[PDB]
């Protein structure tokens, strides 16, 4: 008789259990038993206590994370965790000897270390501190400082700056050990002329003057960071002479203009692959660099370059694909568009231009997961032609026809969204099942692909959910101009298709987005349907991903058009399904969704009663360069300034008179700047439109403070309930 | 059958006519006939066109203001007006010869001039440009640069910095010509170590990166600006040698610590009076400085110092009073507290300590308006014991008993709030009547005080107002602990004391405030009562002015206490009048009112349903030093840190759960910093209270943009209507 209330979502009353493990060897992994770390065996499921809780009672500090050295002799300890941006943070580090069972108290890793990583084998150590790189050959010995040029907010050695972190690497780190730990490949970023975004930080009430944050941040068309790439030989590091770092220069075609280092991948011990991208993100080059013994330098033969380019839009889904090399390093696999525009696996041969495709069809390969000498293991959405499903497939390297599905039939009813975790030589794999049923976690041996045991089945959650009226989940498609376009609906408990429901359209709709999937979730929508009887829906229209280029490249150079209209058209289709009170239709989104939400409410379609935009982009000139220019080119008279000018929400301010509007922005948002919503709010005030604002002091782009998270969703629920006349 | 709507207020449908004039001689003034400037005669009411409109058709620029040189030979023209803060601005200037009828095109006054003023007689000219002072002896000759030290945001010569402008002088200028124009007294402000307030400015949508504003601004207890004072002799300015500026140093008792220059007044050609104030604003000294012919220097005899100090709080209403000297400069008059704590006129004698009072009683002299050799003319609120009335009184200098009221009886029904404008030798005076009836403007001759003619009677407005259902206005008092405490009520049309009305408490309630007066007004309240039938009320409680020190010094060192409780108690009194729906009582205020509004809503009294705080101070440590410390002393363990800590709105965040709350702040407010509302909004989010926010992009402290002014009042009306359940 009870429903999924707001407080159930805001308090995690029903918690989804994960099974988070990490492979140590090829048959041994680790797990956290609330307080204990064990070494589980991949053969038997027997575990012995690897690390007890009372091991670091005496430490004094709270331990954020840990890290085992590859040989299993040392453990790196992380504490005083201070977050920066999406991936970046700062921590104090301690090394603990596992065999001697004691803290290394000499030559300790400094406070405020930006990044640390063990070498792939043994126990070498590379850390970045004040933007410079240091290498430790032994945990208790001095560290050789490899770089000297590192300067705050200007020169980044072995770590990324803002825009590379967010948009290019999805990591703070910019270091790459060679396979056996001999070479340390690193990148360097010059931000000298990159402009600063500035904003207040009001901080604790005890701070009398607001602080001002200043981040090097290239908005669309402004001066970008510049990048150099280096490889240093750690084995011949000297106490007496500074370590010499060999530079691999960008190729001819990339130097002629602004460019990006967008991918670094080691092939073998003496082989490394670089992928450069042009600022105009439709032309990329892949250099393959070998080590010359006599020279001591790296040489990339021109005849080994490979061009990944695209006539119909940007290259890659968000960045070009990474390569997966055979062991001998004379051959690799990656995911490119085929001639009909669908992303599949091409078998490349080191020395030739033409590659041959190993998979094909009207569906896309999502990722390459591991390759052995016998098999290539990949995930795709081929199963039942469902773009929103994920399944694991193995392909035989001796016969491209022999392709087995390893996950499709395991549990076809409860399980359709899979992800994988292979052991250190791909002997075993963990399968995470994400929906539509409750998450399921299993372990298998890839020799015969048979199941071994259930790691987590969420039966503890299952039992509790029977006591609650849960909403149901409809994934389906519709036909627009002869193409399938998928949508999902979170349908209220005891759903009655003859009754008339209020509908909340939940929008993201960015380039290569996908809001219609088979993933079980417990979010606000769950509550909205369950307690408030509102049908929340999502619809992947033009420019959404995993369906080929034709659909994804549709919005090329035309952001804020087709995908906006497609959202309006989606609601129009939903109200023509006849179970929708077309007088009470609302739209809401975050980030890009925030934007679409605003462009739709400002469209004048008349379809939408009200809507909420959280942290919206308002015009593209205000957003970071790499993301924007990827889809928009440059805001110049010679490029695309016209459609930059022509696609802002400020320009649509008049039509907002027709709707009710809640705009929310975190004041300390470094990603989508407060500036964006401030420029919207102004435009509306100017043309006399009334709306609702909520700023969030010192909240950033996630508004994910413990307390702000609660408050923002409470605030929105009140807004939505009232706009739908629900008491 | 029609009422005063919202659009009548937001569009000025019913406009109050002023009569704005400026005396040129002792019997000739100027007026603006929409497009024309005339010279009206004070004897006959005959006017000849002084300046035609088509005189500056050819100018090309729009002319913001004008200014006549005292002799009537030159007119100064103001254009390209760019506003800075409350009084400060920046303009291009042109001088036009009135007799030759042409623009002076040589040695023109520079663009971005910060301030200009004619010398009291003749046609000398002093201007401030890039923080340095320049003097022009003739409109077409080079200017002598008096100062060389002026530096942006640091050194201010002859103009004020932020805090002096806002809190001390109420002017941008810091120049004072001597009576006949020989000496130019100026002030200098050092801001070297004054900290900066920083904030974004989002500007036009065409600005890609928000700008950051940086103003030297001393918050409570921080480092203040320092000040020096100079007198330069303009008659002996040289082309060849730099002009020498004689410094008058602050007295011994002022130098021992932090202090202010708070008043500069010339007594005679060779006599000047300075009033210094301690940072602890209860001790002030007045130095009187005389010119030494042989020296060429200024000497202020110690035996001519006068101390104005206060045992029970701060000295003066907002600053110490200014002196009004007899012609010979051996005697002056000013407004100080008498021994029973009410402000009256003391007759000071240059060479002695003790002054004798010329007026007395339980009421207060408001201002001294002009003195002749025969009469002192002042405004007070004595009439009918009404603190909220203003009337003109003349007092005989030969007999302190003979005091005539010049305005009381003129029109006792329509007119109770008077202000005055005397001619250049006090031969004639203009009376502005401000209420309770329609504003009335009359002219009189002070020789026999008889009326001469009606200048403006607003009959044009009167005619229109008969067609509209107007609200009525009740001024009255109540008795709390044996003291009278006044309140006013804007009562809805056709008011029915047996019916039950919704009440909006309109609060300011700052030190020396007065919201209960006899002034006719057309504001939001008019509409609220007229169209929405809401009783809006105001109540001057403890800490309010014009009633003696006992009432005003009540909140000394105790801001955010008595005056807050007294607002709650006021509502409690109003609901005990029985025409009030005590289920629908709301509070709202701006600035200090914003604060009290928020302190009341956070009180937990239960009396108030909802309320709106616009640009509120949230804790006193965040507000400028001179204002704060005046009432609060220093936020230090040895002074008053405890009550700084104990009187914040953030600390009352929990109780806001009981009320509904709209917080509004302009993001580019340099006065009450956004920081303040941002710290409130945080406090609430943290304790889980829901509220409403509205930020105002680039709006400052007045939120007085044409468009924002409309938008904010619309938004608030919606909030108030809905909180009162009015459709
Ligand atoms: C949550 S997001 O889809 O909006 N998102 C966005 C994103 C995309 C577009 C816009 Cl307008 C805003 C954001 Cl936060 C980025 C930046 N590329 C990202 C990176 C890593 C993970 C998620 C990310
Ligand atoms: C409009 S105000 O009463 O709030 N006000 C305030 C004021 C007083 C207190 C607070 Cl918390 C805020 C303001 Cl704007 C000042 C600053 N002393 C002022 C100067 C000249 C004219 C009006 C002024």
Structural topology:
The structure is a homodimer of 727-residue chains.
Chain A: E1 2-3, H1 6-10, E2 21-23, E3 28-33, E4 36-41, E5 47-51, E6 63-68, E7 74-83, E8 89-97, E9 102-103, E10 113-118, E11 125-129, E12 132-136, E13 144-145, E14 155-157, H2 162-169, E15 175-177, E16 183-190, E17 196-201, E18 211-216, E19 226-233, E20 245-248, H3 252-255, E21 259-268, E22 271-278, E23 283-291, E24 298-299, E25 306-309, E26 324-325, E27 331-337, E28 343-349, E29 356-357, E30 365-371, E31 375-380, E32 391-396, E33 399-405, E34 418-422, E35 428-433, E36 440-445, E37 451-456, H4 459-465, E38 468-469, E39 472-480, E40 483-491, E41 501-507, H5 524-532, E42 535-539, H6 549-552, H7 562-575, E43 580-590, H8 592-601, E44 610-614, H9 625-632, H10 641-645, E45 660-666, H11 674-686, E46 692-696, H12 706-723
Parallel strand pairs in A: 1-38, 41-42, 41-43, 43-44, 44-45, 45-46
Antiparallel strand pairs in A: 2-3, 3-4, 4-5, 6-7, 7-8, 8-9, 10-11, 11-12, 12-13, 14-16, 15-16, 16-19, 17-18, 19-20, 21-22, 22-23, 23-24, 23-25, 26-27, 27-28, 28-29, 30-31, 31-32, 32-33, 34-35, 35-36, 36-37, 39-40, 40-42
One copy of the ligand CS(=O)(=O)n1c(-c2ccc(Cl)cc2Cl)c(CN)c2ccccc21 is lined by residues 166-167, 510, 591-592, 617, 623, 627, 671-672, 701 of chain A.
InterPro entries (chains A, B): AB_hydrolase_fold, Pept_S9_AS, Peptidase_S9_cat, Peptidase_S9B_N, Serine_Prot_S9B/DPPIV
Family (chains A, B): Belongs to the peptidase S9B family. DPPIV subfamily.
Disulfide bonds (chains A, B): 289-300, 346-355, 405-408, 415-433, 610-723
């Amino acid at each position: 008789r009870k429903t999924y209330t707001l407080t159930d979502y805001l308090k995690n009353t029903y918690r989804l259990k994960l099974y988070s493990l990490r492979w140590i060897s090829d048959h041994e992994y680790l797990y956290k038993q609330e307080n204990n770390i064990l070494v589980f065996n991949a053969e038997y499921g027997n575990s012995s206590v690897f690390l007890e809780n009372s091991t670091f009672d005496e430490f004094g500090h709270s331990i954020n994370d840990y890290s085992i050295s590859p040989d299993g002799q040392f453990i790196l300890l992380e504490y005083n965790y201070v977050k920066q941006w999406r991936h970046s943070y700062t921590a104090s580090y301690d090394i603990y000897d596992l065999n001697k069972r004691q803290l290394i108290t000499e030559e300790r890793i400094p406070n405020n270390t930006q990044w640390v990583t063990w070498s792939p084998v043994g126990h070498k150590l590379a850390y970045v501190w004040n933007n410079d790189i240091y290498v430790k050959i032994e945990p208790n010995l001095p560290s050789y400082r490899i770089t000297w040029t590192g300067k705050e907010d200007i020169i980044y050695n072995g770590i990324t700056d803002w825009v590379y972190e967010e948009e290019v690497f999805s990591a703070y780190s910019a270091l790459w050990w060679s396979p056996n730990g001999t070479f340390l490949a690193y990148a360097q970023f010059n931000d000298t002329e990159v402009p600063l975004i500035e904003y207040s930080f009001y901080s604790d009430e005890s701070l009398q003057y607001p602080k001002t944050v200043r981040v090097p941040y290239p908005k669309a068309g402004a001066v970008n960071p510049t990048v150099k790439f280096f490889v240093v030989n750690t084995d011949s590091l000297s106490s007496v002479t500074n370590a010499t770092s060999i530079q691999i220069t960008a190729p001819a075609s990339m130097l002629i203009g602004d460019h990006y280092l967008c991918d670094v991948t080691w092939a073998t011990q003496e082989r490394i692959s670089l992928q450069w991208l042009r600022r105009i993100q439709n032309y990329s080059v892949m250099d393959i660099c070998d080590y010359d013994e006599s020279s001591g330098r790296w040489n990339c033969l021109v005849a080994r370059q490979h061009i990944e380019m695209s006539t119909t839009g940007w290259v890659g889904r968000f960045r070009p694909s990474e390569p997966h090399f055979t062991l001998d390093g004379n051959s690799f696999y990656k995911i490119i568009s085929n001639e009909e525009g669908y992303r599949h696996i091409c078998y490349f041969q080191i020395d030739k231009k033409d590659c041959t495709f190993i998979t094909k069809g009207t569906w896309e390969v999502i990722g390459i997961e591991a390759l052995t000498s016998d098999y290539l293991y990949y995930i795709s959405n081929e199963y039942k032609g469902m773009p929103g499903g994920r399944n694991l497939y193995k392909i035989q390297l001796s016969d491209y026809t022999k392709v087995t599905c390893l996950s499709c039939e395991l549990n076809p009813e409860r399980c359709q969204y899979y992800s994988v975790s292979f052991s250190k030589e791909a002997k075993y794999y963990q399968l995470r099942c994400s929906g539509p049923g409750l998450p399921l976690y299993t372990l298998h041996s890839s020799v015969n692909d048979k199941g071994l045991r259930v790691l987590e089945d969420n039966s503890a959650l299952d039992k509790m959910l029977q006591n609650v009226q849960m909403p149901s989940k409809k994934l389906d498609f519709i036909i627009l101009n002869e193409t399938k376009f998928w949508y999902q609906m979170i349908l209220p408990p005891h759903f009655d298709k003859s009754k008339k429901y209020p509908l909340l359209l939940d929008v993201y709709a960015g380039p290569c987005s996908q809001k219609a999937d088979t993933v079980f979730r417990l979010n606000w929508a769950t509550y909205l349907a369950s307690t408030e009887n509102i049908i929340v829906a999502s619809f992947d229209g033009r420019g959404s991903g995993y369906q080929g280029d034709k659909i994804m490249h549709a919005i090329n150079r035309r952001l804020g058009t087709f995908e906006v209209e497609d959202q309006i058209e989606a609601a129009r289709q939903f109200s023509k399904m006849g179970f929708v009170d077309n007088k009470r239709i609302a739209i809401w989104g975050w980030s890009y969704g925030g934007y679409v939400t605003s462009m739709v409410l400002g469209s004048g379609s008349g379809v939408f009663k009200c809507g909420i935009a959280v942290a919206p982009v308002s015009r593209w000139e205000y957003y970071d360069s790499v993301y924007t220019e990827r889809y928009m080119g440059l805001p110049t008279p010679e490029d695309n300034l016209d459609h930059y000018r022509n696609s802002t929400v400020m320009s649509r301010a008049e039509n907002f008179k027709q709707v009710e509007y809640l705009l929310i922005h975190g004041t300390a948002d470094d990603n989508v700047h407060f500036q964006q919503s401030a420029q919207i709010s102004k435009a509306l005030v100017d043309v006399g439109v009334d709306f609702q604002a909520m700023w969030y002091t010192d909240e950033d782009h996630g508004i994910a403070s413990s307390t702000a998270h609660q408050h923002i969703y409470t605030h929105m629920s009140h807004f939505i309930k009232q706009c739908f006349s629900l008491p």
